[PDB]
């Protein structure tokens, strides 16, 4: 276990999907890589080969010669292909290379039983990191190092924010933070819907809506506040934000809401 | 005549208000404006002066100089009170001023009766003007420019997105963009007791759920996508994000938020 | 394994039922095959014989002369009578000739079984094969060819639309284009008891139900566009649309949509 | 009134929107007419102009020109425009001119007070317009004649099918074929949901709803079945069809459904 060179160190993806490209480019925009630096090779698929080039980085022709190359290796491809992967490569991962799955719903003690030693770190990244707003919680294998870690942390650090947690959450935080945008979804539009429904040009509504829910999510971000008071504060006598949360509260609301997290998360545990 | 000069003009706040202070910080952060040429006045209040002072804000001691020294004078009492503040001004307000009135609930048709003449813009702003992520729509009068029209765009473009409808929509606008943030609130509030529920710690479950909702919004403004096919993009067939929207689907979420919009719409109207 | 002769290759159906009807009916109107082509066998129903005669088939007197007879051999008895079916004809189900189930449940692993090799197709058509607008979807065998799943795409494209899909998806499948026709026909009454409702005339209110449904799925299968965008082109603001829309959200439409097309894939898979 | 020369009218389309379009290309489509026999004129939009010129339609300058040179005219302009638009057009309007609006909402007491006389014809036709699968409806001004009547079948026989009613239907008319694509396409959006929480692949699941919607529209128009008698035909004892079909009937769906269409025409009426 030899500590990997923070400044300088090379990442490969396995899998050339659409999650390695978000953390690749947020990497290279935050400067935390440079594409020089990063390795990925192709499948099946040719349309990806250019959409790495394109941002300068090498595109290699055998999953063997990335994890050669590279001192972290993050695994993104669907998490029913990770197994066969992973095993295939492992005369290769030697403990010097620091090993990532950001595979939804695959746990630590399964990723370190494959690859052979405890040098990994497992993310849950969302949707979001296409944008750089993700959500994202790493859990730390038996061996991965306080520094493994940081540069972990920096790495996901670039496409939105993380946090750390033990892997016995992670059903939970799939249900939440990686379910949770189809959720918001659905009350975008809902949002829209109801601003037609009350007189508002589609166009318009559906802006409004998206920026609403932007906004009151940055509020709660930046704010320091509890959402209670946050409602507090917007709720005047007897007006039409009380109007409004009124009706959600008659209607169970938040309970549905709970519904949703709590069925979405045992469904994870069903499907491990 | 008498066009506001584009780069030079002076802003006056009558109503040193917590809006006010949103709109003042935005323009000077953006360059819009200096802190030399903003005015305000107090009414009574000894904090809301320091909080205008400390960002280079001169406070005057009179509404009326407030007026005499503006090309551009922004209403950000509250509605209740504008109408007698707006008649006490009257004599001042002359045709060569642009007025901007923020008051909720306060139709053009009567600051334009209130003032005396049709050069007023109004705008309908959101709380999030605070982070600079206000979702707001402005309405013109009958003497209002396209030049006064994008001077109003610019400022209110320093504290989020700003869009232009007619005065008719803005009881649809309050329920939806003036009040949603609270839908949000409770909707954050909620997501995170279901990571609780789910087993979550709550400061985890809290940080999910505001990055999660933050991160969806996000994409639904970039994107370019309907909120529907964001919603495919994420439910993989029988996965976990498909169980919970199913729940969701299951208690007619989408209806009750559709409920809350136009009840808050509905009590706007109510008010007016 | 010969390939079967593209252009020229005779069809047998074992069980001539409604759905072998449909097929040959639309395999001749499209003249995919001409009736010389094509045969059967009755076992017990002589009404039937006139059926195919009139449209200048030949019925034999045999399954067994059927499947002597044909390069391809579509299995059209109902599903609990398959298995003996096709253990009586196996000496005569030799690799040469393509097999073809469309018994509804009926699952490749047995077809394969029952047959003794796995040059077999299944197919889960739907009702509306009567009238050339089938959903229909097929799932391919060990052994099929990727030229016999052409020529079985043209013939099933002939009575409507054919997709390609796992066998595991076909419990799910059952219960969504399998089953979903009923849910269509309630709709159907439904919105013409909803017009007589409103006070139309019967007549009237059920030709315009039936159309404005063909006409609806006419635009989403030729659009091009996510069915919320369809939904959004035509809700104008405060308009009839979205008011109707709102009761359906009142009432969790969506999601009772949802649960049927759950229960009967569960029906389907307990059927198993 | 001298009846429009059958074989031989020219046909003016006044706001050159997509259902001029749609009606356009049918008419042609259809050889109900040559594009020399028609002509619309340009508003807002010069994008418009390519779309009739590309399929050979004159443009012409002005709707007074477009009124002078046809013997039918068609008002496609949005409603809330149409009043003053006739209004300006009116000396031009003389009773050997058959008028016709497809106007939304707009009743032929006010289209024949607008045009000053009787020979006009209102057609409400859908969305469908566009795949030629509109539904349609017309109800005859004081003055329209039997050959009025047919004329105006076969131009809106191109773009679907066109049925006759007295004008005090249309608000429910409205409410069922008007607004109903709605219904129906978040009906094809929850059957794709269902599938995808049923396993399905997010593509496949649509398509079939889609079409699962189609081919069932297409039985109950050409099966000539009342739509009992074809859920009765696909409802095998105990299978999963029914199953399905008892979910539905457990939440009320008919009512559902009825609810909507009965709101649609309330709100249609209340705009009225
Ligand atoms: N996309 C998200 O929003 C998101 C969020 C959280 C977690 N994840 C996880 O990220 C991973 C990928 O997600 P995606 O959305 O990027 O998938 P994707 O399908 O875009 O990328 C998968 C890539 O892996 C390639 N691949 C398949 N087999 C391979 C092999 N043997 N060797 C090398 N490459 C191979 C495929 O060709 C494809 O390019 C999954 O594990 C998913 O759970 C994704
Ligand atoms: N705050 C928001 O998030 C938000 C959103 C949309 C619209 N608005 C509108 O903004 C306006 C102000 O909102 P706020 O939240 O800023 O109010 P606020 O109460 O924080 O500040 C209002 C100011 O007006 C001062 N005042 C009272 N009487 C006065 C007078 N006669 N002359 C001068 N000043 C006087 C009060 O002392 C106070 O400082 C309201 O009309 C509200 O509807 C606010
Ligand atoms: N009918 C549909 O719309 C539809 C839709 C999807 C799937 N399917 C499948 O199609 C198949 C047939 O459906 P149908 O509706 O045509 O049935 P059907 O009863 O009309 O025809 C079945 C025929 O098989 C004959 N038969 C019975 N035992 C036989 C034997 N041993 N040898 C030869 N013929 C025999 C019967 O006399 C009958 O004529 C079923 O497996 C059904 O699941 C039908
Ligand atoms: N589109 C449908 O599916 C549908 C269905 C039923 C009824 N309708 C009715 O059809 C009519 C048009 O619908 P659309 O969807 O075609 O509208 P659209 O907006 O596409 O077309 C309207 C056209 O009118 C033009 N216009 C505006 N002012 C004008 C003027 N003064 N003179 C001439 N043209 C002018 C606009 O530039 C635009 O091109 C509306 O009355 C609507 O209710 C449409
Ligand atoms: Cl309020
Ligand atoms: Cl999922
Ligand atoms: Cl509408
Ligand atoms: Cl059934």
Partial sequence: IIPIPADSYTLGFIGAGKMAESIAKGAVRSGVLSPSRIKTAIHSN???????????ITVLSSNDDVVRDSNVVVFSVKPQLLKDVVLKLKPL?????????????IKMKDLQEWAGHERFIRVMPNTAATVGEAASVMSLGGA????????????????????????????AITGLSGSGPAYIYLAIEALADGGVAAGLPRDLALSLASQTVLGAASMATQSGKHPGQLKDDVTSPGGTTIAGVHELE??????????????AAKRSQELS
């Avoid at 972990?152 to 992670?170: C, E, H, N, R, T």
């Fill in 46 to 56: 040719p349309a990806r080969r250019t959409a790495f080039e394109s941002i300068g």
């Fill in 93 to 105: 991962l030697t403990k010097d290379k620091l090993l990532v799955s950001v595979a939804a719903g």
């Fill in 144 to 171: 991965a190092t306080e520094e493994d870690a940081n540069l972990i942390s920096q790495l996901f650090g670039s496409i939105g924010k993380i946090w750390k947690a033990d892997d016995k959450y992670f059903d």
């Fill in 250 to 263: 008659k209607a169970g609301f938040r309970g549905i809401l709970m519904n949703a997290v709590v069925a």
